[PDB]
Copies of this chain bind each other. A is one copy, B any other.
Amino acid sequence: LEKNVIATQLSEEAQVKLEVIQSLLEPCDRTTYGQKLREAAEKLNVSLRTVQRLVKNWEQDGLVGLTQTSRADKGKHRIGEFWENFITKTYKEGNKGSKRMTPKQVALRVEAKARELKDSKPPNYKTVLRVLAPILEKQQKAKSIRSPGWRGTTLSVKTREGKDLSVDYSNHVWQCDHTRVDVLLVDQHGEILSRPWLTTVIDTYSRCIMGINLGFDAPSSGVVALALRHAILPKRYGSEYKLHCEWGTYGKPEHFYTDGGKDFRSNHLSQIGAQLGFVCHLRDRPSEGGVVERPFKTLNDQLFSTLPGYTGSNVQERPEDAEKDARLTLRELEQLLVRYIVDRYNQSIDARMGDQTRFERWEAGLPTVPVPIPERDLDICLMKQSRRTVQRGGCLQFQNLMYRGEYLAGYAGETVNLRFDPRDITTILVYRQENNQEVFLTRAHAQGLETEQLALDEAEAASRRLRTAGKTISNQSLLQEVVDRDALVATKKSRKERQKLEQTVLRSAAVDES
């Protein structure tokens, strides 16, 4: 084991004592000790015994023997031990759970106990503040602790299962999460809508952003599936994005690492994982998600805080003009956000390295050039209805709609896996199991509405209105209920319901991409 003490900058009295010690450092003759000790007593204006004591402290200890020594009672209160423990316990107990008691309130409890004990001289307010001083101080360091982070090139990710998985190359481990964007948006007229949701997908080996989905829709496994589709497929943008670089990323993960939200623990994402072959894993804590969490802070600082309609990070920062100053449509915010991610964010230097651009680290990081996946082969992203049973005459029933198709009647009594798109359920793909291998059977079409379209949400909402009204349900009556609601909304003086208008602007951006 080891120990040492070193003097800090000497005080002026300690400097003088240093000159006296140097005056007493040379001699070898008892006569010269006596001479220089007596002149040192005169120089310090002290007794001869005092100079002897000074030399002895510098002999048995360092320069810290000729600096002053602090008192033994420094940092001990002179009030009784009962009172110091009473003040300490009263403060701590006053803060259990939701309660928040101030030192002044503690002082009132001190005075109340003093009346019970008939103590004419209890600790006053300043003494209570001093007694609680270190208790309040420690707290202020514990809240501020910095984490070292990772040093680079070697990285692993802690899962909620307690397992640590390494990250070895680009597209080894993707991560994803959603946020509100801190910007208010307007419709194509200039009336306010909502703050949109931004979903990002990001590669853990390179920190390069793989894809995004920006829209008014609340988070869902459908939103995660749209974001995976954009991440995975090769990307191209028209001149209206004004890009100078290309996003240039594509291909599919080996693992997908997420929060514990229902969106990512949904059966829909699990079916996407099993078809594309990328097992999912849940993060242990939000602090393990640093690679996906931090980019939202970076976007707030570099992008969103400069745009009209900025709402601040939270209500306490909200500019009073945030609703007076909203101007961007969703299509215009996406033009800005994609220019920023392609020309700026993915072109910045990767932290934890300093040598490499984030994209260059993705591209050089690849084990091999990934083979592009044809867009039609992302029909793996369709939801599966785990079974339906082929009724007599080849019918299937699904969400109240009745479907028939080109071969189904030969399979009556079997169970088939319907695979469907929630954006348009008027046609469904039917798959069956043969030799424990799922195979394609046919496309099934909702009888009598093959020329229409219906999202699953329209069919579900119209079905509730039919059940509430007490009317029967069939393909024609369900279709009539849907087109009648859109006609009734068209009679409204605003033609607005929040979702109908947010969907109109979102769909207008979605179908302007081509």
Contacts and interface: CB of A to CB of B under 8 A. Distances in A.
A285 interface: no
Contacts of A357: 473
Contacts of A111: 475, 480
Contacts of A474: 349
Contact of A466 (B4, B98, B354): B354
Contacts of A141: 412-414
A67 B100 contact: no
Contacts of A336: 486, 489
A115 B477 contact: yes
Interface in A97-120: 97-102, 104-105, 108-109, 111-112, 115
Contacts of A290: none
Nearest to A104: B301
A511 interface: no
Interface string A75-104: 000000000000000000010011111101
Nearest to A394: B148
Contact of A146 (B392, B466, B493): B392
Contact of A310 (B98, B105, B326, B499): B98
Contact of A486 (B324, B339, B431, B494): B339
A182 to B, nearest CB: 10
Contacts of A480: 108, 111-112, 115
Interface of A: 1-11, 14, 64, 67-68, 70, 94, 97-102, 104-105, 108-109, 111-112, 115, 141-142, 144-148, 151-152, 186, 190, 242, 244-245, 301-303, 305-312, 314-316, 319, 321-322, 324-328, 332, 335-336, 339-340, 343-344, 347-349, 354-357, 391-393, 395, 397, 402, 407, 412-414, 431, 433, 435-440, 443, 447-448, 466, 469-470, 473-487, 489-490, 493-499
Given A5-B439, A99-B319, A148-B402, 7 more contacts: A8-B438, A98-B310, A146-B392, A327-B496, A340-B486, A347-B479, A355-B469
